[PDB]
Design a protein around this ligand. Sequence first.
Ligand SMILES: Nc1ncnc2cc[nH]c12
Ligand SMILES: Nc1ncnc2cc[nH]c12
Ligand SMILES: [Ca+2]
Ligand SMILES: [Ca+2]
Ligand SMILES: [Ca+2]
Ligand SMILES: [Cl-]
Ligand SMILES: [Cl-]
Ligand SMILES: [Cl-]
Ligand SMILES: [Cl-]
Ligand SMILES: [Cl-]
Lengths: 233, 233
Amino acid sequence: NAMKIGIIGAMEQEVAILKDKIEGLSTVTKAGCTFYTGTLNGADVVLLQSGIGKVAAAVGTTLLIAEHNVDVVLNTGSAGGFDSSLNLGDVVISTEVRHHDADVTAFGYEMGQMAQQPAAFIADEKLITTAEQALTEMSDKHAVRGLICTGDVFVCTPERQEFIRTHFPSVIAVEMEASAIAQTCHQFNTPFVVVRAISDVADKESPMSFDEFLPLAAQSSSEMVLNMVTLLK
Amino acid sequence: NAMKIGIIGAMEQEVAILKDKIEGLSTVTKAGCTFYTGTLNGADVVLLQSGIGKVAAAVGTTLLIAEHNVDVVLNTGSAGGFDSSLNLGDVVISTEVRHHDADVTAFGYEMGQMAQQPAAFIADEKLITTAEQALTEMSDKHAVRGLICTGDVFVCTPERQEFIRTHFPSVIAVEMEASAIAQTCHQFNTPFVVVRAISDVADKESPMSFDEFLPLAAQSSSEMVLNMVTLLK
Ligand SMILES: Nc1ncnc2cc[nH]c12
Ligand SMILES: Nc1ncnc2cc[nH]c12
Ligand SMILES: [Ca+2]
Ligand SMILES: [Ca+2]
Ligand SMILES: [Ca+2]
Ligand SMILES: [Cl-]
Ligand SMILES: [Cl-]
Ligand SMILES: [Cl-]
Ligand SMILES: [Cl-]
Ligand SMILES: [Cl-]
């Protein structure tokens, strides 16, 4: 018996680096998802390319846990930076994750809290400790640990930035899958962590420059995840 | 072999009427979802209580299709009315569904279209025909057929109604799961239809009157689904 490590990225570029390192690779496709199973430095992994956004991530995470038998989930890829200390390419590690675009305050929930869910999804303590160790193995890579907020939006306006900061002042980064991954993992009682890297600062120029910085972000976040899975073997 | 009809409702009250009609019932729970399997007037059904919101609906729909082997999906329950002809308790039938809260327009997608997804999810022609025949079997029940818009929000402010109407002028009703169910069905190439009923008109009065009319909405939409399953079996 060994841990089975799920790794989730949304986009082809976010998974390709890790894909090509897997040994004893097998491939499955289902519901628009691709699953690459094998070993990464002797760790048993299942690497999922989910697609973008909350529903795609939830579909894929569900399959990853229910059909691919993973024990923990690591979410890799790019994110939009909100913490002022971040630079492009820097790592972000989730302490917790929230939906920035959920509002059932009608019924007394706090902003971001989905009905019947906790207000925040707490990343696993052991996986955070593993992420810290993984970061030390990189060459002078800066990270920030903190709240990651997700919505079905690529944030690129000052108005949407101000809404998010009004309700989630501690937010360090935004993206489009983490809270779906985290919620699904909560429903399945599965440990998770998000270890992404910054592609942009979620401003008006960001949609145009995303593509130029995605390779950097994918490289950083992939190097984190490779170091983590090796630590977990 | 017979068609296996999946039926999805978010809340206990949305599934309770149908649950008690099932014959040869068996129950299982997974990931915060409850699945009620048996027959409804001789049709093979799997009735899912998913939970509220897009992620919960996606998790449940994924299990319903992948693990419970359903061939079609009917989404039941309550919705907030937008079309001016709708009264409390009236039925809404989806022609198509969109995410009202998705925005990746800066990458060229249209409003509401998720990246890597079609702009709208089209309800199945045969299931819509069946819904129309079910509606005729009711005693003088008014319905509107049209676009249903989903988001992770219980809509109850004029500002949010105005945003939705600005971007989706043909919307007939809003709710919190349909686009997740429909996207998941798209990904699984599974037919779907939404056949909900009106609990409120998505205004400032709607948070505190929802509960009074949820039983009415559950009654109408359950009667539609029961009529449909008899026809589809
Ligand atoms: N600005 C942004 N908004 C949402 N997701 C991402 C992912 C990278 N940049 C982002
Ligand atoms: N006003 C509303 N907004 C979202 N979903 C529902 C479901 C019933 N009424 C609704
Ligand atoms: Ca062992
Ligand atoms: Ca290789
Ligand atoms: Ca560019
Ligand atoms: Cl890509
Ligand atoms: Cl920090
Ligand atoms: Cl209920
Ligand atoms: Cl949800
Ligand atoms: Cl009509």
